[PDB]
Ligand binder design. Sequence first.
Ligand SMILES: *[C@@H]1O[C@H](CO)[C@@H](O)[C@H](O)[C@H]1NC(C)=O
Lengths: 129, 54, 113, 54
Amino acid sequence: SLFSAVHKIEEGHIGVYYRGGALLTSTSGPGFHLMLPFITSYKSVQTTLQTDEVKNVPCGTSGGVMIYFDRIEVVNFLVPNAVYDIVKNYTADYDKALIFNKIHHELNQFCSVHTLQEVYIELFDQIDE
Amino acid sequence: ASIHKIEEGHLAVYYRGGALLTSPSGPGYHIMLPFITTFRSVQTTLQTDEVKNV
Amino acid sequence: VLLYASIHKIEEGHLAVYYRGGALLTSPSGPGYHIMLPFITTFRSVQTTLQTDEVKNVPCGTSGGVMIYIDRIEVVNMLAPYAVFDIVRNYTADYDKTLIFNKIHHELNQFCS
Amino acid sequence: AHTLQEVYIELFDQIDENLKQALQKDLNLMAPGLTIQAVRVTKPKIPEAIRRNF
Ligand SMILES: *[C@@H]1O[C@H](CO)[C@@H](O)[C@H](O)[C@H]1NC(C)=O
């Protein structure tokens, strides 16, 4: 009954509501909030700085040798006003389809132009940028 | 039970006896004919998929 | 009991930040006894005095291509009391993991490459 | 049209672009409306004998 209506949003998140699969154009900030009892589903998307990583990323150097980055972490944040558009276009898991599904391709494209030494030592500080 | 609650980011196309009705339907709750009509939703947003060992 | 549920103590050098339904109430409390609504509101005390923490076995790839592992890197820090509200509003309470000790390894690696 | 070196190293950054260009060129006239936002490819697996030499 009213148990489902209430829901905590947590600080630093924004809640997006689905009306049986359709995204309402109303978003709720942190704090106590109330929605419809059973025909609306809320999910909170983080709008503060957050981090996530991908492990064992291959990288083929210009010399034909393959080197595997153990871990590549990306720290990102989403402005609160664009949350509605972001979730509408790419759902609540936008990060996987926007960043971490192409990290490996970007790394391989960068590596293909640089040699093993060039990536391992010389321009290591430039890989991040 | 006929209600189908089309998803967000998809668009639904119906089939009345294996025929494409000219009327689509956007996200949200919708009502179709009880049994003669069957719906299916195709994703109109960004969609990823791959082929392996090419 | 209401008293047992609500009464809480804030240690010296710590600033308390409360949460009602996930929101951040704009009213931090200093050390000493304090009253908060028993059930809905929950407190967490962030240390503002000098604090220490450490990271282990940080790798380092020297310019010669050889790997050297630094066993222990300790950082001691502190934040002014007035900044507790903002530093908790962003980065949550556990600001250290995402502000210092996640970047330690990468900064050291960049320096020592 | 390309050799092992060109595909494996030199033109890797162009494999995906060429694939996307070809597919979109076909679809433009076959099935208007569909668009290929992006394409990705992993590095090819070259033979073991050629791998040792590298
Ligand atoms: C479907 O085929 C017709 C007939 O060739 C063509 O005019 C039309 O553009 C095509 N549309 C799509 C979406 O494939």
